From a paper:
The reductive dehalogenases (RDases) are key enzymes in organohalide respiration, which is performed by a unique subset of bacteria. The RDases are cobalamin-dependent and able to selectively cleave carbon-halogen bonds through reduction. The RDases can be split into two classes: (i) the canonical respiratory dehalogenases, which use a halogenated compound as a final electron acceptor during organohalide respiration and (ii) the catabolic respiratory dehalogenases that occur in the catabolic pathways of non-organohalide respiring bacteria. Structural insight into RDase function is based on two enzymes that have been crystallised, the respiratory perchloroethene (PCE) Sulfurospirillum multivorans reductive dehalogenase (PceA), and the catabolic reductive dehalogenase from Nitratireductor pacificus pht-3B (NpRdhA).
The NpRdhA variant K488Q was previously reported to lack 35-DB-4-OH reductase activity. Crystals of the K488Q variant were obtained in the same condition as the wild type NpRdhAN crystals. Alignment of chain A of K488Q and the NpRdhAN structure gave an rmsd of 0.179 over 680 residues. The only major difference occurred, as expected, at position Q488. An overlay of the three K488Q NpRdhA monomers reveals multiple conformations of Q488 and adjacent residues S422 and R552, also implicated in substrate binding. The K488Q crystal structure confirms that no significant changes occur to the wider protein active site. EPR analysis of the K488Q variant reveals a sharpening of spectral features upon addition of substrate, but not the clear cobalt-halogen interaction seen with WT NpRdhA, suggesting non-productive binding with water remaining as the fifth ligand to the cobalt ion. Thus, it seems that the K488Q mutation disrupts the halide ion and substrate binding properties of the active site, likely a consequence of the disorder induced at positions S422 and R552, as well as perturbation of the Tyr426 pKa. The extent by which the K488Q mutation disrupts substrate binding casts light on the critical role K488 plays in this enzyme. Unfortunately, crystal structures of K488Q ligand complexes could not be obtained, despite several attempts.
Author numbering: -3 to 697
Write the structure that this text describes.
């Protein structure tokens, strides 16, 4: 039994308070400043180590600590208290461990800092868990924590400073690698740390931490420093049990009992199988032109004029997403190599693939992944041709390292799924995963093993079969999304392929096929009816619930009451809170088939998927012509929808686009292939049932 979960829900807790119970700490109005440095590692990092890679990505993010400042619109809220809450929530959303605000005095902006800056958003990121000595990959990680954590701080400072700049206010990010103000001094004044023997000590962050700061003239309500002496209250019973929905005081200690390479969720308790729960006929799977990605189809005109127009901006309507974009786009040149590499003898003992897998897994979790799985990168997982030159893509690497980034339950529980924070929920997981995989792929290359990552911005593999084969999800009704037994459908994946030899994981079986046969919630709640209410079909050689990717693409690119859409992730019953009750309801789903229908039905009865306005922390801002304003057309504020009735699965008719109905390999964005919807509808009426496939396959056995 895993006992580290929260006993208490955070459903009434606003996001600006964060996962720690900082409001229950002893505070005073001021404290006398005193010299102090940030926590540093206990050991130095060898040439076997990560260090050079996390320093490169910190240097990349440094490029975006300052930037162009948008014109001021008329929709930025005035209240410094609301601004504070929104910015603090923004920082926690990007996984700041601890956040605070303080006023800048003249002494701070007397340096290179812009002198119009009056306020500082201070935030700390806790050191990562490191492998114990003798565990695989320890020497990859030992002594890199300050730079790994500094990278993360530089990332968050870059995004948050750009978010404020896109709202019309000059803002500059600061971290150890590039600061114009005294970080430690502001960490104390903002109430994140105290000083002990000249080193910062923060409550709750027992592992050490590193700092980032965003200074700005954007006026904010300030916080107060910690009581400089004596017990702050960190172990009070309310904090220890986390009654307000916060991190239990025992969770750190319980966590450290598991090996780092196993992750935080108990995937070891999920049944493994040699073949996936759904049928995969490799000899019948054709490789798809990357020009068949319907975003690429929309870009090239295949879906009409409006989809073409909006393809570039649809996920970048919101200033927060616009803060992430420079990082997303400029990480692409660093994704890695396709040519074979000579082993360089760095990295310690790489002769045990079982140990290499553990080290890559430990490496992922250390860098902030939520799941890691390894499978082998089969040639049919690669696109046939790229979309820009049309040239063939090679199956150049042997293995795929697949990592899931949780999109975030609490933010989505306040959102509609298709409102102004949707694309920011995708894009956050997109850049965070691209970061992590860029760093790991780079470290594989340092060890002389070709490695290349595959981002939202540039992938040469299709993630979904790798998510399946790595045992991170099952085929779900949502269609082009796989569902994980602990975080449901609430994930964005990042992959990097490599030649580094690693033991592969096996597919998982947690009963989801039988569960989805009894559930229609995501299908019922989709704004454009893109999800199938019917049975699974055969599609390009594998069994799948085929969603209508044409309808979904047009909705995500074109709908004007939000930025993109991910509502089908919010509505699934497996989208649950990380509480004892939530894990138990998942356990029951997995272990007790006779209870699945009751859980499916009570998820609607208890009105799960209804919006929680406590959690609506973001501003509704649409950028139009480079200026952030109120939304032109409004804001999706959807709640639970009703029953399409008993016969919908027989009457819904969707379009599918297997390779036959796609642009052929070699086609480029320079060509236009209007989507053949009538053929896609007829195609899907004609699809083989998975049952017939198994019969037909059996006769050639
Ligand atoms: C463009 C795109 C979309 C498009 C169109 C996809 C399409 N079919 O053309 C629309 C615009 C449809 C889309 C929608 C969403 N998608 Co999207 N999509 C992409 C993207 C970038 C490319 C798809 C592609 O490469 N070519 C299109 C061709 C290959 O499609 P296809 O032949 O029909 O095959 C699809 C499936 O059959 C599956 N697949 C392919 N081969 C095999 C083999 C087996 C055995 C199985 C089981 C599945 C499988 O993968 C393809 C996904 O489109 C990928 C990122 C990536 N590199 O995979 C994600 C991605 C697949 N989608 C993702 C997500 C999260 C979404 C959304 C929920 C929105 C969001 N919050 O981001 C919705 C969900 C829609 C749904 N009903 O499932 C995630 C899925 C992660 C997961 N948990 O499985 C991905 C992997 C991005 C990521 N990095 O996490 N997006
Ligand atoms: S299938 Fe597409 S349009 Fe429908 S809810 Fe999911 S993301 Fe939104
Ligand atoms: S909403 Fe229901 S049918 Fe859809 S993926 Fe989730 S469990 Fe499966
Ligand atoms: Na739910």
């Amino acid at each position: 039994a895993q006992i580290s979960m929260r006993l208490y829900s955070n459903r009434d807790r606003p996001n600006h308070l964060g996962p720690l119970a900082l409001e229950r700490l002893a505070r005073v109005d001021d404290v006398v400043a005193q010299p102090a440095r940030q926590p540093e590692d206990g050991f130095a990092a060898s040439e076997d180590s990560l260090l050079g890679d996390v320093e490169e990505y910190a240097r990349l993010f440094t490029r975006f600590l300052d930037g162009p400042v948008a014109p001021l619109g008329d929709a930025i809220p005035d209240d410094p208290a609301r601004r504070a809450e929104n910015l603090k929530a923004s920082a926690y959303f990007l996984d700041a461990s601890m956040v605070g605000i303080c006023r800048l005095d003249p002494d701070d902006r007397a340096g290179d800092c812009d002198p119009s800056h009056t306020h500082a958003l201070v935030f700390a990121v806790q050191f990562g868990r490191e492998p114990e000595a003798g565990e695989a990959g320890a020497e990859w990680i030992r002594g890199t924590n300050a730079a790994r954590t500094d990278m993360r701080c530089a990332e968050i400072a870059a995004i948050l400073s750009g978010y404020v700049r896109w709202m019309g206010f000059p803002a500059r990010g600061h971290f150890s690698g590039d600061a114009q103000v005294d970080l430690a001094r502001l960490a104390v004044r903002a109430g994140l740390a105290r000083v002990v023997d000249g080193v910062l000590v923060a409550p709750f962050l027992r592992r050490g931490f590193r700092l980032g700061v965003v200074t700005t003239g954007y006026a904010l309500a300030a916080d107060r420093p910690l009581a400089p002496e004596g017990d702050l209250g960190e172990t009070a019973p309310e904090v220890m049990l986390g009654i307000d929905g916060t991190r239990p005081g025992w969770e750190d200690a319980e966590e450290e009992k598991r090996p780092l390479h196993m992750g935080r969720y108990p995937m070891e308790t999920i049944r493994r199988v040699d073949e996936p729960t759904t049928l995969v006929v490799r000899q019948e799977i054709q490789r798809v032109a990357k020009r068949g990605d319907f975003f690429k189809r929309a870009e090239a005109g295949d879906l009409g004029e409006k989809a073409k127009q909006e393809k570039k901006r649809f996920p970048m309507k919101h200033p927060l997403a616009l803060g992430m974009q420079p990082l997303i786009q400029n990480m692409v040149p660093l994704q890695g190599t396709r040519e074979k590499l000579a082993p360089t003898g760095k990295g310690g003992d790489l002769s045990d693939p079982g140990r290499n897998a553990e080290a890559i897994k430990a490496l992922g979790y250390y860098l902030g992944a939520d799941f890691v799985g390894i499978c082998r990168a089969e040639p049919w997982m690669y696109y046939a041709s790229d979309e820009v030159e049309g040239k063939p893509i090679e199956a150049y690497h042997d293995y795929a390292v697949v990592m899931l980034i949780d999109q975030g339950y609490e933010t989505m529980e306040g959102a509609s799924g298709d409102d102004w924070i949707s694309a920011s929920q995708s894009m956050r997981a997109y850049m965070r995963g691209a970061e992590i995989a860029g760093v790991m792929a780079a470290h594989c290359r340092r060890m002389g093993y070709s490695a290349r990552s595959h981002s939202n911005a540039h992938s040469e593999v299709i993630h979904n079969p790798a998510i399946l084969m790595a045992g991170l999800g099952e085929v779900s009704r949502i269609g082009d999304t796989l569902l994980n037994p602990f975080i449901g459908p609430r994930s964005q994946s990042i992959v990097f392929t490599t030649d580094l030899p690693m033991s592969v994981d096996r597919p998982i079986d947690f009963g989801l096929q039988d569960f989805c046969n009894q559930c229609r919630k995501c299908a019922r709640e989709c704004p454009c009816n893109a999800i199938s209410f019917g049975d699974k079909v055969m599609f390009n050689g594998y069994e799948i619930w085929k969603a209508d990717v044409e309808k979904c693409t047009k909705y995500r690119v074109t709908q004007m009451k939000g930025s993109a859409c991910g509502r089908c992730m919010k509505m699934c019953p497996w989208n649950r809170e990380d509480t004892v009750e939530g894990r138990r309801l998942a356990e029951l789903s997995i272990k007790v088939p006779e209870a699945r229908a009751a859980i499916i039905a009570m998820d609607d009865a208890l009105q799960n998927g209804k919006r929680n306005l406590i959690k609506r922390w973001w501003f509704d801002l649409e950028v139009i012509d480079g200026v952030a304003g109120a939304p032109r057309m409004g804001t999706n504020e959807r709640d639970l929808s009703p029953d399409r009735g008993d016969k919908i699965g027989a009457n819904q008719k969707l379009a599918m686009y297997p390779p036959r109905l796609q642009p052929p390999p070699g086609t480029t964005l320079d060509a236009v292939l209007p989507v053949d919807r009538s053929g896609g509808l007829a195609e899907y009426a004609a699809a083989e049932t998975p049952a017939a496939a198994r019969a037909r396959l059996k006769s050639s056995a």
